[PDB]
Amino acid sequence: GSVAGRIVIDDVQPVVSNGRYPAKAVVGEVVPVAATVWREGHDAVAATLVVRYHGTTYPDLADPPKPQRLPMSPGHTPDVFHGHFTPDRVGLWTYRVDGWGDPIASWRHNVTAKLLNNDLLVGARLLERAATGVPRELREALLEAAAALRAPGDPFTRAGAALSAEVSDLLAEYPLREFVTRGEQYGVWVDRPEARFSSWYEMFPRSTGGWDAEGRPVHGTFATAAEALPRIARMGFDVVYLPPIHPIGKVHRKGRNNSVTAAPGDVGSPWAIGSDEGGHDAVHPQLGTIEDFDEFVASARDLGLEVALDLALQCAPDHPWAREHPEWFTVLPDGSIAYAENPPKKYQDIYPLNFDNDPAGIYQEVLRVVRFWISHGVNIFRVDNPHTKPPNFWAWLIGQIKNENPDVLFLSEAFTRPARLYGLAKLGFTQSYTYFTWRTSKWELTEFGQEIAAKADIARPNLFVNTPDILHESLQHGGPGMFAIRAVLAATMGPAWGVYSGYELFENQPVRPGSEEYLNSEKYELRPRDFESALARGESLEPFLTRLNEIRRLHPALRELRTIRFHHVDNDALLAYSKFDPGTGDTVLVVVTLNPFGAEEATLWLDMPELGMEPYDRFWVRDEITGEEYQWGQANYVRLDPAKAVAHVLNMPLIPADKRLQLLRRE
Amino acid sequence: GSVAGRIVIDDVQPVVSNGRYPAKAVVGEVVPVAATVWREGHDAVAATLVVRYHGTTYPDLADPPPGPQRLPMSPGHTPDVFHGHFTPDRVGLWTYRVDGWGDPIASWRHNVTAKLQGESELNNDLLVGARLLERAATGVPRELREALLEAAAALRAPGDPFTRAGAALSAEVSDLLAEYPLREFVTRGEQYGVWVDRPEARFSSWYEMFPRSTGGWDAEGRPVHGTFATAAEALPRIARMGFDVVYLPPIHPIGKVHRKGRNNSVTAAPGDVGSPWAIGSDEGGHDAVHPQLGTIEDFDEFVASARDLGLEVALDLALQCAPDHPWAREHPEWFTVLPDGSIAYAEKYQDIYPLNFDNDPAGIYQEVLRVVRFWISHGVNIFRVDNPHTKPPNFWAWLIGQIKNENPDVLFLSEAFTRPARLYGLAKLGFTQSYTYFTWRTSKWELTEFGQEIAAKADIARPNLFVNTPDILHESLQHGGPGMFAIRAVLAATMGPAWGVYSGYELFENQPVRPGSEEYLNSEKYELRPRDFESALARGESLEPFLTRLNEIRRLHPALRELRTIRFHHVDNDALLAYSKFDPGTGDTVLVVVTLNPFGAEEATLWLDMPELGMEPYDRFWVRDEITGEEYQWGQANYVRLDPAKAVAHVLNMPLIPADKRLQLLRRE
Ligand SMILES: OC[C@H]1O[C@H](O[C@H]2[C@H](O)[C@@H](O)[C@@H](O)O[C@@H]2CO)[C@H](O)[C@@H](O)[C@@H]1O
Ligand SMILES: OC[C@H]1O[C@H](O[C@H]2[C@H](O)[C@@H](O)[C@@H](O)O[C@@H]2CO)[C@H](O)[C@@H](O)[C@@H]1O
Ligand SMILES: [Cl-]
Ligand SMILES: [Cl-]
Ligand code: NA
Ligand code: NA
Ligand code: NA
Ligand code: NA
Ligand code: NA
Ligand code: NA
Ligand code: NA
Ligand code: NA
Ligand code: NA
Ligand code: NA
Ligand code: NA
Ligand code: NA
Ligand code: NA
Ligand code: NA
Ligand code: NA
Ligand code: NA
Ligand code: NA
Ligand code: NA
Ligand code: NA
């Protein structure tokens, strides 16, 4: 939406909730901008994209308790202008569309249609006026063209210089602009590249302790956890995500397999935060000290990994806050506090917090906890169920944190209805968990991929193949082939993707039939794993996960969300989609089977202009999985055998600069 | 759009260009409002629609040159979306705001009913409920609190939970809470505008006629130049046909310099009348009447004659000049003067100069304003504006703004046959109605897309569907015979809440100037065209009775006033089209089945979208045909046949839609 002046500017994009929230982008991302710009008559109109960097000041998005002048090109959609900008630093960037009348282009159209004396002299006065705004060293071309128009003779000779590409190119750089109408200014918050493009590996530090001589698991420490990091870095992951590392409640502790009663020696859930040993600003005594955690962070950094900590705003009954601050809880008429819930899920080991009784106290206390972890080198937080806490609290918290350190990122674990999922992303959550795991059919995956592309300005997905809470029925019944299928889908549809430890060992047993919970869930017991022995035996997905991360690093098309395009493949068990990088022209096409058992074949009909080609063009592709090279065209035979490869991940011909910016247009 | 507080409100509709322009409505129209409203957890959320009337102050919708009712909103079937509505009862600026709030009593009533478990388990919930009723009672007048206070004591009394929760769940307590709800964390949304015009802005039937062609003929068979007196005598038959707006081409003196001759000839012959759009001569300009029409007093008698017949007058507003118009002599600053001293003609329009609004904006703006106010002072409350897309957009916003602030009942129809961004852009800037691409939409797929687009744009533009204009004799009408004239009139009158006919359409005038042209042969724009409508009617060679019946059907069915309720229904024949509309106010429902083939019979099964008609797929019902009188028993799948020699359409009166279903069918998302 825009402004109405002598020139009209309308339906400007990207604009979120009418300008209530900034759009999202990352450093080095090409941001497309569209605007409808119009005026009266057959007269030429043009637009300028005005871009400015505002520094690292981050806005408060909820109620608590030198600029660049860039050209805009007219599109094939009449009256729509398109531009783009590539932010080169973290912070708040703004853009504005300025509309203007282009008198010289109007003259050029009228004279060419006519090919006259009056029109020719009018042209001369326009070029003379244009020259007053051109540098002294470049004026001549315009002045000489004006003199020719004025001179007597044939109209074709007279208008020759004025209609030339030399004059046209000079004016494209220094235009004679009339009735300059200033559009509304819209914000884009620009984060570091990891906000969009990152590979996550989730692991429990307590499970890194191995076993004793009797095969009994030994509780890991920050020292053993640090030794488990080189293989994760070798697989190409750059974020190590840890469940909560604080002391675990001793009161109402859960036992093995989500049992309401713990037996002696039972470790309990890391999400039951707090005991007499400390709360959210303490480390679990069996893991080590805060100094041992600092050494774990330094080890992760030396391996090129960064740590993401779980931020769980809840308390075990023995957490220090449960005695020191009863106002932070909902006390029932009988004096008791009800255990936390997320229907149908029950959390008997914890109390939910109340943010309404004493907002100032609890806001400052959570801010203190987050600031504490940031000072210990944590710049990423995975936030549990943000949709169960007040939405204005998250906006306040993210705002306070980003104003002190703009590189701190937050991942929203909100498995909720779309309005709240995207609403939380609008309020400042860097990344969001999605419905990925439950999208298994060709139709579901097509709709899912098209939706993440369409929501690119609002939310960044993080596609986890599995989590400690999610072992999908598809992985339970599909064997190793299905493990490979889901990893291809997440790594190529998701610029951010994730794997929870054990996925590479094909762990597929649920607690009971019809459940999505893992049998002997690591949430309630030590789960050491011998990854090196499974690797040695050829029984690991570790080499394949490594290959997927290498393909991602080699192909910048895989950092993109908005460039996803699905191609027609005449088989319900086959899915095909491409992505491109508007920055380099890098293009990737994925052909993946959804059948993990038998072979699948079909004819793949490519949407050639989306690949920057003509229907009868023939071209070479290289499969990044096998190294096999094929010559393809508009219609190609495809065959996938899950025993050899579950997908082709093809390096496609580069899309030229002119074509890639056009294919990036919004409308 | 919205806000984020303790409650979040998002994606509010109707909102035009992010709030830059007000949405459109008319007096008596049900306006639907939607908003996404959400909070944390499983706790209930509710919303209130806050409506205010601001009077007739009209906003300036562009930068000119330097020179409260609390209405309940219902949760919908779409999760997190709330739906409301308001019916403005008077002309002017209305605003609405969505207020979101936590609803603790709805959360309590749900949790308690689910458990209702024994007394020991429910005890805490029953006691929480008692505290909620007391919090609610504080916002209730002292004389009404009793029921809430008694229900709270009963919740605390020992005994069976059913007996304790009884009074708390009673209708009497529930009704009181509906009047004075306990609202927590009230979050106030953004205020959005709705400009409300008189009903004619949406629902009106237009007839275009040239006053000069109402003079008839002399004894030699030569046309006689009509006057305002003969034009008034041509109004009774227009009123009997059921039109309520008579649209006149310009009524001012016509230019003598470069006057166009018959059939768009660049040179006029002595005695040639010229184009009415070549405004102005030494006899006067835009504030003058053509001397052959009569005086300004004869025009006043013409407007009085129109009013007494139930018609209102729409004058053509053409911002351009013949070379001999007073302005071209007195104000050269209002034109683009070329280097040789001449002024180029408008664009091909050789008989006129276009105006320049940029040289002296203050002078020309004030002069156009004086001219428009002059015609309003003579009883003109509607202006049909020529090619507004050729004049600066901020000029229109300023002019409509100045006029409507003084005279809010003045309406403007935009004749902008241009690209969508400018056509809809001018509607957003204030044009009451807009001409459309209607005439060029002839196939089933073009007409389906057309109807769905006009329904999607209802908050921003109101169409006026002319079957023909003096500039457009469509090829479909040139080759389709009388049957096609009847088909296009059904489509325009049933799809368009505003529609129009240009004089001569009822005589089936179908001859173009040359093959491949949309210009009429012997165009009334360049010559006098008297027509003997009475003799054609007596010979049964007129569409006059059919146009009368179409306007009668429109008056009888309020569903035909509507734009947003059009729904197309599947019919198995490429030459048949079917669509319904309903009125959310009364439940009046109409279904049209029309043939696009004027030559032969066409049949098919019509497959109704039964929920869209407030019915179940298995339902059976009666319909009445407004064209023939025939009644039929229908279901979900119905056999239909149209023989254009008998009737080109069925216009069916459908069963009334019940009140709850019709507001639900009006929902935005
Ligand atoms: O100890 C509390 C609770 O922890 C786990 O639930 C977590 C979940 O695993 C996380 O992904 C997070 O997002 O929120 C939940 C609540 O903290 C256990 O699954 C659960 O049994 C246990 O009670
Ligand atoms: O005399 C000027 C011009 O008048 C007619 O064109 C009109 C047209 O009929 C109207 O519908 C209006 O919207 O704008 C046009 C310009 O005023 C004639 O068609 C044309 O030949 C003539 O030059
Ligand atoms: Cl934020
Ligand atoms: Cl007439
Ligand atoms: Na704007
Ligand atoms: Na991009
Ligand atoms: Na646009
Ligand atoms: Na233009
Ligand atoms: Na334009
Ligand atoms: Na990136
Ligand atoms: Na809060
Ligand atoms: Na990707
Ligand atoms: Na709002
Ligand atoms: Na909404
Ligand atoms: Na109580
Ligand atoms: Na003078
Ligand atoms: Na006309
Ligand atoms: Na016919
Ligand atoms: Na004509
Ligand atoms: Na005619
Ligand atoms: Na004719
Ligand atoms: Na007549
Ligand atoms: Na309407």
Automatic annotation (TrEMBL), chain A:
Positions of alpha-maltose 1-phosphate binding: 254, 314, 349, 385, 523-524
- Could you tell me which SUPFAM superfamilies the record lists for this protein? (Trans)glycosidases
Q: Single Gene Ontology BP term? A: alpha-glucan biosynthetic process
Looking up InterPro entries in the UniProt record yields:
GH, GH13_cat_dom, GlgE, GLGE_C, GlgE_dom_N/S, Glyco_hydro_b, Ig-like_fold
Q: Site Transition state stabilizer: list residues.
A: 469
Asked if the keyword Membrane belongs to this entry, the reply reads: no
Q: Which reaction does it catalyse?
A: alpha-maltose 1-phosphate + [(1->4)-alpha-D-glucosyl](n) = [(1->4)-alpha-D-glucosyl](n+2) + phosphate
- What EC designation does it have? 2.4.99.16
The GO terms this record gives for MF are: hexosyltransferase activity; hydrolase activity, hydrolyzing O-glycosyl compounds
Give the span(s) annotated as Disordered: 259-278
Top-level taxonomic group = Bacteria
Domain named Glycosyl hydrolase family 13 catalytic: which ranges? Answer: 198-533
**Keywords in UniProt for this one?**
Carbohydrate metabolism, Glycosyltransferase, Transferase
Q: Which CDD domains does the UniProt record give?
A: AmyAc_GlgE_like
One Pfam entry name: GLGE_C
| Glycosyltransferase as UniProt keyword | yes
Main EC class the enzyme belongs to: transferase
What residues sit in the active site?
Answer: 384 (nucleophile), 413 (proton donor)
Q: Which residues form a coiled coil?
A: none
Function of the protein = Maltosyltransferase that uses maltose 1-phosphate (M1P) as the sugar donor to elongate linear or branched alpha-(1->4)-glucans. Is involved in a branched alpha-glucan biosynthetic pathway from trehalose, together with TreS, Mak and GlgB.
Belongs to which family? Belongs to the glycosyl hydrolase 13 family. GlgE subfamily.
The record describes its quaternary structure and partners as: Homodimer.
HAMAP family named among the record's database cross-references: GlgE (MF_02124)
Name listed for the protein in its UniProt record: Alpha-1,4-glucan:maltose-1-phosphate maltosyltransferase
What is the scientific name of the source organism?
Answer: Mycolicibacterium thermoresistibile (strain ATCC 19527 / DSM 44167 / CIP 105390 / JCM 6362 / NCTC 10409 / 316)
